[PDB]
C-alpha cells in the first residue's frame, strides 16, 4: 500500500506520480520512479521511498526522478540509481551502484560499497562517512578537465576508496580520505587531509593547504605537491615520481632506487635516498639523487652540492645558479649554458662550467643533456652523445676535441670558430634561431657524420661554409645541402663555383673527405661537389 509496517515485508511495486512508501519493516525489490522530478533540494518535490528507523530496503531500483530517503537507523542494501535519481542517506547503505545517479551522505550516514559510474556523484558531507567506494567517473578529460559535481566529493571521511580510470576523488578542505589506491587514469585532488594513499599509476594533487601523509608512489604514479601543499612520509618506488612545485613542501621523503624526484631549489624537500639524507631548503640542495625520471632545477641565485645524476636523471642549472660536487653517471642529463656554474665528474672525467668567464670544459651531453655557448663563451673538450645537443649562439666558440657521437646534435646559430678538432659521427646544422655562416675549425675528423648546410642557387653563389684553418679534413663527412632559394631557379656557377669548404693557411683535405648525402638541383642544373688542387671543395653546375 503506502506504509510498510514493522515486522511486515513487501515485495515488488513501483512508485510513480509522487506516491509514497514509508518503510518501517522491509521493502524488497521496489522500483522508485518518483520524488525527485524537480531536481535535488526542491520544496516542490513530493513522493518517494522513505526508510524509517528500523526499516530496511533490499534491491531497490531508483530510476530517473526517483528519490530514496534513508533516515538515521534506516538501512538499505543493494541499490542501483540511474541518472536523474537520488538517495539521501542518514542511515546505512551497503552496495549502491550509481549509473549517473547521486548519493548524498548526510551527517551520521555511512555509505559502504558505492560504485560511481557514468557521471554520478557521491557527496560525503561533514560528519558523514564513505567506506569501500569505487570511483569510475569524475576525471574524464584528464587532470586539467573539470567535471564539477561528479565522482566523489569528500567533506567528511572517506575510507578504503578505489579510484579507477576516469575516477576522481576531491578531498575538500575539511574532508579526510584515509585509505586510497589510485590507478592509471584516476586522480585524487587534496584540499584536506589524505592518509595512506597508494598511487598504482594514478595521480595525487596536493593543493594549497592540503596535506598528504604516508603516500606510496608506485610505478607510473605521480604525486604533485603544489604551492602551499604538504606531503609527509612519501615513499617513491621504482618508476614512481614525486614532484614538488615552487613553494611546495615534502618532508620525510623516501626515494628508493628508481624513484624520481622532480623539484627545484624554490621548493622544500627533505628525506633520504639511496645514498643517505638530502635536503632542499632556502634555495640550497644538498645530497640530491636524481633517478631515472628525476630532475633538479637549480634556479638563478640558488645552489646545489653533492648531487648525483644517475641514468635517466636530469640536472638543470640556470644562468646564475651553482652546482658543485656533481656526479654524472653514464646516461645522466646535464642542462646548462655558459652563464651557469657547475663542477664535478662525468663518465669521461672532470668537467666544469665557469659562469663568470663563460668557459666550459669536459662536458658530456647525452640522454637529453644540452649546453648552449653564449657570445664570447667557450666549450672545450665537449663530448655530445646520443640525444645530446650542443648549441652555439653567434659569437660562441669551441676548443680542444669536440666529439659528436651518432645521434648527437650541434646547432650553429652564427659564425663559429673551433680552435681544435671536431670529430663528427653525428649531425651538425647551420640555423638562424636567411644569413649564411662559417664553421671554422683547425681539424675536421669525419666519422660518417653529417653537416647540414644552406645554399642559394639563384645566382648569388652564396652558402654556408666550412673553413679548415691550417690542419686537415680527414675521414668521411656527409654534406646535406638545402637550397633556400626558389626551387625552379637554377643559375650556373662560374669559375671554380661555390666554395663550400675552404682550406686555408696550408690546410689539406683528403680526396674523399666530403660527399653530398643527396642530390642538389635547381632549374636546369645539377650541382656536384668537387675537390680541386687548392684543397678546397666547390659546388659546380652541370646539365
Numbering used by the authors: 2 to 434, 452 to 561
Task: Give the original sentences from the paper that presented this experimental model.
The best-characterised SAAT, antigen 43 (Ag43), is a protein that contributes to cell aggregation and biofilm formation in commensal Escherichia coli K-12 as well as in major pathotypes including enterohemorrhagic E. coli (EHEC) and uropathogenic E. coli (UPEC). Ag43 possesses a modular domain organisation that is common throughout the ATs, which encompasses an N-terminal signal sequence that directs the secretion of the protein across the inner membrane, a passenger (α) domain that is responsible for the function of the protein, and a C-terminal translocator (β) domain that facilitates the translocation of the functional α-domain to the cell surface. After translocation, the Ag43 α-domain (α43) is cleaved but remains attached to the cell via non-covalent interactions. Similar to α43a 13, the α-domain of all three Ag43 variants folds into an L-shaped right-handed three-stranded β-helix, with each turn of the β-spine comprising three β-strands linked by loop regions.
The α43_UTI89 and α43_EDL933 structures in this work correspond to the uncleaved α-domains. To investigate whether this mechanism of self-association is conserved in Ag43UTI89, which imparts a reduced aggregation phenotype, we first examined its oligomerisation in the crystal lattice. Generation of crystallographically related molecules of α43_UTI89 (i.e. symmetrically related molecules in the crystal lattice) revealed a head-to-tail dimer repeated along the crystal, which resembled the α43a–α43a functional dimer. However, while α43a trans-dimers are stabilised by two interfaces consisting of a total of 18 hydrogen bonds and two salt bridges, α43_UTI89 dimers are formed via interactions from a single interface comprising 13 hydrogen bonds. To test if this α43_UTI89 crystallographic interface was indeed involved in mediating bacterial aggregation, we constructed a mutant with seven amino acid substitutions (Ag43UTI89-mt: T32G, N60G, D79G, T80G, T98G, N100G, N137G; mutations to glycine were adopted as glycine residues are enriched in the loop regions of Ag43 β-helices; Supplementary Fig. 2). Modification of the single interface in Ag43UTI89 completely abolished the ability of this protein to promote aggregation, confirming the self-association interface observed in the crystal lattice. Conversely, the reduced aggregation phenotype of Ag43UTI89 is a direct result of the weaker α43_UTI89 dimers, which are only stabilised by a single interface encompassing 13 hydrogen bonds. It appears that the inability of α43_UTI89 to form a double interface may be due to the presence of long sidechains on residues such as R161 or D133 in the F2–F3 loops mapping in the lower part of the β-helix, which in a head-to-tail association via a double interface would result in steric clashes between interacting proteins, although we cannot rule out other amino acids that might also interfere with this interaction.
